[PDB]
Amino acid sequence: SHVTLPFYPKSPQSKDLIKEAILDNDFMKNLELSQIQEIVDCMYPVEYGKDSCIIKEGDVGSLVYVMEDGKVEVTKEGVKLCTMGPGKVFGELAILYNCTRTATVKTLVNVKLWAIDRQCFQTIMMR
Amino acid sequence: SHVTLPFYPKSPQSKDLIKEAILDNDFMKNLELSQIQEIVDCMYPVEYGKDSCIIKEGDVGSLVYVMEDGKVEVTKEGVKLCTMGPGKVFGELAILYNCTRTATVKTLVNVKLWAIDRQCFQTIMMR
Numbered sequence: 191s192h193v194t195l196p197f198y199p200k201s202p203q204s205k206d207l208i209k210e211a212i213l214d215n216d217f218m219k220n221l222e223l224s225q226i227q228e229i230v231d232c233m234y235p236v237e238y239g240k241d242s243c244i245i246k247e248g249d250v251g252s253l254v255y256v257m258e259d260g261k262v263e264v265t266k267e268g269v270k271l272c273t274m275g276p277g278k279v280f281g282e283l284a285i286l287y288n289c290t291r292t293a294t295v296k297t298l299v300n301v302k303l304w305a306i307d308r309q310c311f312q313t314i315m316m317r
Numbered sequence: 318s319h320v321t322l323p324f325y326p327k328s329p330q331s332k333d334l335i336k337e338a339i340l341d342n343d344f345m346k347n348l349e350l351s352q353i354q355e356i357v358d359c360m361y362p363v364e365y366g367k368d369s370c371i372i373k374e375g376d377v378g379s380l381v382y383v384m385e386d387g388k389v390e391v392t393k394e395g396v397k398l399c400t401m402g403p404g405k406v407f408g409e410l411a412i413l414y415n416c417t418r419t420a421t422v423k424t425l426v427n428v429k430l431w432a433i434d435r436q437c438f439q440t441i442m443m444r
């Protein structure tokens with residue numbers, strides 16, 4: 191009669207970081223505040239070690255990430271585009287380019303992230 | 318005193334094409350049926366010729382479309398992402414993400430579409 195989204199409990203400071211990361215993101219700054227709240231409770235945590243490759247350009251890609259701790263470097267076709275520290279969203283562009291990753295993301299140090307899948311996202315967007 | 322949504326009369330064949338098109342859409346799959354029916358009745362027909370530009374990335378989005386006949390070609394910042402045939406919904410991103418058109422959409426052949434405007438569309442998602 192309607193499918194249940196999963197809830198992942200977080201520290202207040204974490205929920206704040208996420209909200210701010212979305213509001214700082216060009217594609218998503220305008221979402222409902224009620225929608226953002228829901229996204230925050232759905233994001234689950236994932237950790238990567240340094241010289242780990244999170245996203246490979248060209249790949250198919252659902253997941254969207256917010257960085258909590260650490261630092262990554264974004265490269266396309268060989269070129270550094272930038273680095274990203276906590277408070278930044280990445281992985282959003284896949285959907286806008288036909289679910290294909292548009293750049294590769296490598297970890298420069300250990301990182302702690304939050305993630306959310308295509309599917310959760312879509313249910314939310316219809317509320 | 319509540320607002321009256323418009324009604325555009327349609328061939329049962331067309332009412333089904335639309336319904337299917339909605340269910341095929343990642344986001345709209347999610348709607349209750351009562352609502353998918355309301356949306357079907359608020360769609361109005363529009364045609365474009367070969368080599369027409371329906372949607373321009375960056376512009377403001379007010380309508381959402383379903384294709385009935387024809388083939389259309391999606392592009393972003395100058396790169397063929399995909400093509401779309403009958404039965405497929407489009408122009409739903411800008412509305413849901415409350416952003417500016419995320420891709421350009423050009424016709425490859427003469428097309429016949431149905432359109433619902435932001436107004437009716439949102440009004441419907443609220444019951």
Ligand SMILES: Nc1nc2c(ncn2[C@@H]2O[C@@H]3COP(=O)(O)O[C@H]3[C@H]2O)c(=O)[nH]1
Pocket residue numbers: 245251264266271272279280281282283284285290291292293294295
């Ligand atoms: N393509 C691109 N991606 C970037 C840039 N800066 C940060 N990113 C992030 O890198 C991500 C790579 O995967 P996505 O395309 O899913 O989403 C992309 C963005 O979130 C940039 O300058 N170009």
Ligand SMILES: Nc1nc2c(ncn2[C@@H]2O[C@@H]3COP(=O)(O)O[C@H]3[C@H]2O)c(=O)[nH]1
Pocket residue numbers: 285286287288289372378391393398399406407408409410411412417418419420421422
């Ligand atoms: N940005 C983008 N839009 C697409 C793609 N494939 C289909 N579309 C549709 O094209 C529409 C362009 O305008 P919208 O951003 O409103 O909504 C978009 C989607 O419905 C794609 O790969 N990228």
